[PDB]
Amino acid sequence: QTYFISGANRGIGFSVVQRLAAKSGVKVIATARDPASATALNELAKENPQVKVVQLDISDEESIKKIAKNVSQYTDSIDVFVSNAAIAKSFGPLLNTPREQWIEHFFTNVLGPIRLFQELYPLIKKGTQKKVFFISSNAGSLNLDFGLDFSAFGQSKAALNYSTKELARQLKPENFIVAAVHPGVVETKITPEESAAALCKLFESLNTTGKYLSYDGTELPW
């Protein structure tokens, strides 16, 4: 079973790859913007050569244009796709959010994942599990009130949520399992190791498409 994970160099992404590298019969395509600086992940891949380290910047269309061939070097298929790489840089009031923050969150957090999926769709189509996870945020819900504003961050997660919902409908006949997942705050904060563990078991047990899920397996409103 081939897993693909964007942003595997640090955070939850690293913790998810750490966990898969201990699981027998798991090939892992792990991405980093800058693999030669990805010390922890390059070490992970040397001690566990089933872990393949590939370049991806999801903000960079030229990098996304290369991801299908970069993945194609190591596998004929993807079972479980995880769009994890993302940014969270702008919060607070709309009047105080400049153009560049709106633009950056759209390109990195919405366009990136849509283009990434478009490029890797043929490889996912040939796999067995056809499981597709976009790492989202509960802040992206149009129906939760945290007593906070999330500015471009929140808008970006809501935009990708909208398209994830549509993708779930569109791919249901091809028996794809498409989910948006809040990995927790790494609300009580959790360790990347804890988010990873919960995410892993969610990834294995999820059998229906079109869900918006917290890491604990409970549903969120869109």
Next chain:
Amino acid sequence: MEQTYFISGANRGIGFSVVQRLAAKSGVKVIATARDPASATALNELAKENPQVKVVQLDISDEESIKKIAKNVSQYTDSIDVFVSNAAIAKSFGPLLNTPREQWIEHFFTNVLGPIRLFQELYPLIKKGTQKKVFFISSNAGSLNLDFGLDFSAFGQSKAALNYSTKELARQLKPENFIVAAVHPGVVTKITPEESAAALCKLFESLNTTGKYLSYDGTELPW
């Protein structure tokens, strides 16, 4: 008792019908925008007959046009009572795998960033007015909780993103007594733009509560 309205995309469609409807009311000044005012025949004709209609250039896809809207509107008015972000595009429908990069980008810049930047530039003028009413012309296709059995692709995504930011804005400007709404103007099941405009103008007049997602008939939609 004189009210100023700002309507973007006033050269045709709902915007034109809204400006046409406001032009008939006494004591209402209208700042009406067009991408290309020289070719805005019907709107220019309306402005010739009714001097309370001022026509100004605005391209909401264009940061350079948006950077000028505040100073240009200020030649015609010291305040805006009712702001209506109507100018937008609807060019991208159907499945995610068939929607190329440029359609996602165009709907982001035109339908999300444009309205947000336009509001930022015009806020001071709206702050200075009495009604403090802020309308974003959205779509029921932007809802995260409606199913129409249609794919809305970059159009729907853009309406959901603008919806997300509208709801936040309503929270931020509640202590300044702003009324902020996202409004579905109808499908122009279909109605005419003059029917939409009649319903929309009644809605803009009566709404006295912020943070609503409404249809033209004044019923609420789920976000």
